Ligand binder design. Structure first.
Ligand SMILES: [Mg+2]
Ligand SMILES: [Mg+2]
Ligand SMILES: [Mg+2]
Ligand SMILES: [Mg+2]
Ligand SMILES: [Mg+2]
Ligand SMILES: [Mg+2]
Ligand SMILES: [Mg+2]
Ligand SMILES: [Mg+2]
Ligand SMILES: [Mg+2]
Ligand SMILES: [Mg+2]
Ligand SMILES: [Mg+2]
Ligand SMILES: [Mg+2]
Ligand SMILES: [Mg+2]
Ligand SMILES: [Mg+2]
Ligand SMILES: [Mg+2]
Ligand SMILES: [Mg+2]
Ligand SMILES: [Mg+2]
Ligand SMILES: [Mg+2]
Ligand SMILES: [Mg+2]
Ligand SMILES: [Mg+2]
Ligand SMILES: [Mg+2]
Ligand SMILES: [Mg+2]
Ligand SMILES: [Mg+2]
Ligand SMILES: [Mg+2]
Lengths: 115, 194, 195, 118
RNA sequence: UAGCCUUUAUAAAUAAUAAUUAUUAUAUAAUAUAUUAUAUAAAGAAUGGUACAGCAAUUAAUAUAUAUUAGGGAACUAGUUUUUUAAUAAUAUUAAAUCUCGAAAUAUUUAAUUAUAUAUAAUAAAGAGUCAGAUUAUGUGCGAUAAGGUAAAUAAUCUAAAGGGAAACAGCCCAGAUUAAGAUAUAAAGUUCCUAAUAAAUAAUAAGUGAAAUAAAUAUUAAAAU
RNA sequence: UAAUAUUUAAAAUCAAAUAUAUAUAUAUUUGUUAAUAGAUAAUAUACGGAUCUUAAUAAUAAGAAUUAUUUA
RNA sequence: GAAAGAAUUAAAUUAAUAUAAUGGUAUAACUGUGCGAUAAUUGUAACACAAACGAGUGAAACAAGUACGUAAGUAUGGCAUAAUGAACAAAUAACACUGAUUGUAAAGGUUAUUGAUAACGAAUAAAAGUUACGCUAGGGAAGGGUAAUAUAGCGAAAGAGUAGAUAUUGUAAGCUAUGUUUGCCACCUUCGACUCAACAUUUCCUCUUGGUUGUAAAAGCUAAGAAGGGUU
RNA sequence: GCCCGGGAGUCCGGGCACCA
């Protein structure tokens, strides 16, 4: 091989969703090699160490006192509140299921059970 | 050593390794009532080198060790590879026994009352043999092992015998203290000048 | 013994790069930390090749040899390998073969300095002038009490500078990471981490 | 090759023009600041004339404007040196300097602070 | 095929573009050592590792009547001293495409607000052309810090852009021609004549240096400063 | 004040100016050489050309068309 | 005041990671061990990243079963990023889907799997040369630039020169000029002889001159002015 | 992949399909 001339393409990894941005459950937030960012509140981590939203909400980047020397990406459930959330204050959950008003639907639901 | 903060690069920098060496060293505390030198543990390692060829030799060595001490040894495997000597990793070679408490005391007594005396030309342990944090070591040839009670009683049973190293760990802060302590237990240090 | 031929293990080719024009006012390698009299670059930064350096060195040496307890030390080393294509060959077909070693020299850097109780400063100056002739820039003689070249028409004294303690500064105006660390160190967090 | 007949110096007229341009830029900034101040005054509860009069004029808060106001970062024309009105720092010139008039759109571009020693 | 262009249109449509607020600290005032309001300073929400800066770790370079480890040579009666040889340690100094512990600006970029609505985005139904570009400036790779060279990156112009300037001029500097008209502002450029338009001030130059394309080391002569 | 050996600097220093409490202090900003030689090829001198450097005695009168810093 | 325990702090890091390099990793992904060989299972996969399409990547959730775990939970192979190949035509199984007059079948389809086109979006199952006897359509899909080399000149001076760098010489390194050589670039598509020469000066001769322990003279050497005439 | 030649196993050489 007199000349070299081989190389791979860029991988397009990096942040795909920025502080303040509204994610939806599933949306990929960060692509990375290794964990330069760690999953925080309401955030999952896939096989690539890709961070993604577990819930609808607002993306925030933070430093967690419990974990010094680690950067966190998380989803705050609503905009107003900060994300490295007070340790002892009750955890803000979503619930986020709707109730079957339509009577037939409700009946069906009632009927259906595990196998 | 911590970094002088005369530049901004020092800020989140790991400290400088010790002026003398790579490794960090302990503080020498003064010898008071609370921390007098004492015998901590005796480790015996018999690395039979001829066991590179014959693996039964290792077993025999281990048995010998057991006989000498009265507590189960543990096998010593060859941790490295080297062509010059016929050495390949993953090869059982010799036995290592950790002696503590009463057992270790017993062993030491046996060494001092019987063996070290009986060995023909022994001029005592070398004074340079200090670990430097209060550890002392010395060898025994393949011949001297015959002088132990458990072996001497049946020479018919032990055709091959294997030499060994003996390491003695002490609660001593420094080597000289340790050697003084050892002398108390009848260890001749006439081997050299410190 | 080998400032002109540094022994890197992996002999690897190197992109041409550019000679730094130290804009933040470096002052690094611009003072004479040993020796009495020195030889500094006066002009724009230049790439000095090993051969040139050697020739300069040899020129200087003849002046020093006579002196009792007189010696010359070389401040810069030719660390950058240069590959040159054969003249006859055309463009393409990759990079050329390793030719020689060079060193990028910023504007105010000291190439050499000397000392030797016996030596008269005039002689030293002369020597340095002679050395200069072998090198591809314009050079200036420096003494132990001559102010440092920062730019190419600008000087400074290193003794007049802000002696800061940077830890203190950091504490005063802290980064986020540091703050986080401090918080972590604080009692409750330490207690409740449960690792 | 192809003859781009552009001189290494500037004519006096050109220099004057440059100076004027510089002054104008400064003036714009000043005007902006003034406007901001009077807005602030009005918010507080004053008339236009009163605001104009006021001794304690308010500095601007927005970062950019503040930076512009600082003479360390963005000099005014009278403050500025001759060597910086008609030359820029070129990293690859002889003398590390180059006439501003060589800079692509120098009539629009602003560029005051050359490096400290270069 | 996507990208860039066009036509017609759609709307529980402002999503588009631009900036601002967002942070930290200080001072003052008011309430409960905290919170709010006002002022001021700070390259000021979040993302980042280039310049610069640095030599920490990694990779390299230098210097020791310094320390240790052995060797060579040497003196007196194996011990010893000196002269060192190499290595390691110590202290000082240095640099790098594939080192960054410090670290810009520009940049990516978020919600709300304000400004752009004769405006932008999105979507739907239809159409295309284009896929040998060029130069300038900036930061690069290749070349020899050669090329009106070559390869990509960013911005502009040219391509497809007439007008004024750059003597003449694709790509430079200004400026975008619907049609006139020619009074007033002017842009870049100029103002002795050619050639539209000029008067001053302070210095320096005596070479026609120079007057729109700056030729180097160095030498001589003078001038200032210490 | 003569001779003497470097340097061609506003970093330091001094002077001046602006912003902050203000007759001071703090912070920022600006102010530091010139000639000559070196110098050079082929149709023709080649700033585009003419040409431009000033002077008493005298002009209701010219005084750089160069370089640097400016004004109207 | 001691012993033991729980630790905590510092250092953590280039050790180790199936495998290159990078990023990560002690809160361990790294190592040891118990159980387990089960998530190296089965239907729907929203939504993102990426992206011309074909493809690729992460993945919440719903349902079926399994493993470990006191539980919380965790597992849809491997710490991450490589480890790959379209359709067509064949082949093997399952499906109960059509069955060309009806019934069977054949054949096709659905689902699952198999072998390659490395010129790796693969023209065919199957393919090398030569033409200076050639032909057609087209495209250009010495000069100009550069000065590495060459020639020429300067600055400094190692060294020659019976002595002494600078009469004369002048290593390697420095700074330039020329576009007379060998190249490079791709804006652009014949060497000699004869005849006649024109122009230049970096002057071979002739004219003037400076230096020359190396100008006694004569011959020279070297340098300055000089292109009028001449130069087989 | 299947079949040979030199009970099982290894090590070698022939064919026979596959060759889209
Ligand atoms: Mg890559
Ligand atoms: Mg650097
Ligand atoms: Mg032109
Ligand atoms: Mg198209
Ligand atoms: Mg880089
Ligand atoms: Mg094409
Ligand atoms: Mg080109
Ligand atoms: Mg065209
Ligand atoms: Mg035009
Ligand atoms: Mg346009
Ligand atoms: Mg128009
Ligand atoms: Mg002239
Ligand atoms: Mg000119
Ligand atoms: Mg001419
Ligand atoms: Mg002109
Ligand atoms: Mg690693
Ligand atoms: Mg694992
Ligand atoms: Mg797609
Ligand atoms: Mg093929
Ligand atoms: Mg193909
Ligand atoms: Mg073929
Ligand atoms: Mg040609
Ligand atoms: Mg040519
Ligand atoms: Mg001549």
């Amino acid at each position: 091989s007199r000349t070299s001339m081989k190389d791979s393409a860029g991988r397009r990894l990096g942040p795909k969703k920025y502080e303040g941005q509204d994610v939806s459950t599933g949306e990929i937030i960060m692509r990375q090699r290794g964990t330069k960012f760690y999953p925080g509140e309401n955030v999952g981590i896939g096989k690539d160490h890709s961070i993604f939203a577990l819930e609808p909400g607002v993306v925030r980047y933070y430093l967690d006192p419990f974990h010094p020397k680690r950067k966190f990406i998380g989803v705050a459930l609503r905009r107003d509140l900060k994300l490295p959330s007070p340790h002892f204050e009750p955890t803000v959950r979503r619930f986020g299921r709707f109730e079957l008003t339509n009577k037939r639907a409700a009946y069906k639901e009632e009927n259906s059970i595990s196998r | 050593r911590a970094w002088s903060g005369d530049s901004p690069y020092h800020l989140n920098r790991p400290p400088k390794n010790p002026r003398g060496s790579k490794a960090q060293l302990p503080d020498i505390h003064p010898i008071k009532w609370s921390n007098i030198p004492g015998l901590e543990s005796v480790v015996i390692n018999c690395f039979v080198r001829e066991a590179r060829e014959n693996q039964l030799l290792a077993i025999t060595a281990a048995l010998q060790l057991q006989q000498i001490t009265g507590c189960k040894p543990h096998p010593i495997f060859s941790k490295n590879d080297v062509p010059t000597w016929k050495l390949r990793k993953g090869h059982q070679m010799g036995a290592k026994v950790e002696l503590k408490g009463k057992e270790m005391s017993q062993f030491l007594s046996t060494l001092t009352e019987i063996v070290l005396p009986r060995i023909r030309e022994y001029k005592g342990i070398s004074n340079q043999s200090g670990n430097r944090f209060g550890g002392i070591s010395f060898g025994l040839t393949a011949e001297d092992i015959k002088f132990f009670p458990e072996i001497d009683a049946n020479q018919d049973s032990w055709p091959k015998t294997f030499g060994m190293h003996i390491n003695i760990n002490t609660s001593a802060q420094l080597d000289y203290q340790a050697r003084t302590l050892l002398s108390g237990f009848q260890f001749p240090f006439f081997g050299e000048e410190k | 013994k080998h400032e002109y031929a540094p022994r890197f293990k992996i002999v690897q080719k190197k992109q041409k790069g550019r000679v730094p024009v130290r804009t933040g006012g470096s002052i690094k390698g611009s003072t004479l930390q040993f020796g009495k009299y020195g030889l500094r670059l006066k002009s724009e930064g230049i790439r000095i090749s090993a051969q040139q350096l050697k020739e300069a060195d040899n020129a200087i040496m003849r002046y020093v040899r006579p002196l009792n307890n007189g010696h010359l030390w070389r401040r810069l080393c030719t660390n950058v390998a240069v590959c040159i294509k054969g003249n006859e060959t055309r463009m393409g077909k990759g990079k050329g073969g390793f030719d020689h070693w060079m060193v990028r020299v910023p504007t105010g850097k000291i190439l050499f300095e000397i000392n030797g109780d016996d030596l008269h400063e005039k002689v030293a100056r002369e020597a340095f002038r002679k050395a200069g002739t072998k090198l591809p820039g314009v050079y200036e003689f420096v003494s132990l009490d001559s102010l440092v070249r920062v730019g190419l028409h600008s000087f400074k004294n290193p003794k007049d500078d802000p002696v800061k303690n940077f830890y203190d500064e950091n504490a005063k105006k802290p980064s986020k990471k540091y703050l986080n660390i401090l918080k972590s160190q604080e009692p409750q967090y330490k207690l409740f981490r449960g690792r | 090759g192809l003859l781009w007949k552009i001189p290494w110096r500037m004519s006096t007229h050109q220099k004057t023009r440059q100076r004027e341009r510089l002054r104008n830029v400064d003036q714009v900034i000043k005007q902006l600041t003034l406007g901001l101040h009077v807005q602030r005054c009005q918010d507080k509860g004053l008339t236009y004339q009163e605001a104009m009069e006021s001794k304690k004029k308010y500095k601007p808060r927005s970062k950019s404007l503040r930076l512009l106001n600082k003479p360390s970062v963005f000099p005014k024309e009278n403050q500025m040196s001759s060597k910086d009105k008609y030359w820029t720092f070129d990293k690859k010139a002889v003398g590390y300097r180059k006439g501003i008039h060589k800079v692509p759109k120098w009539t629009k571009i602003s560029i005051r602070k050359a490096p400290k020693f270069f």
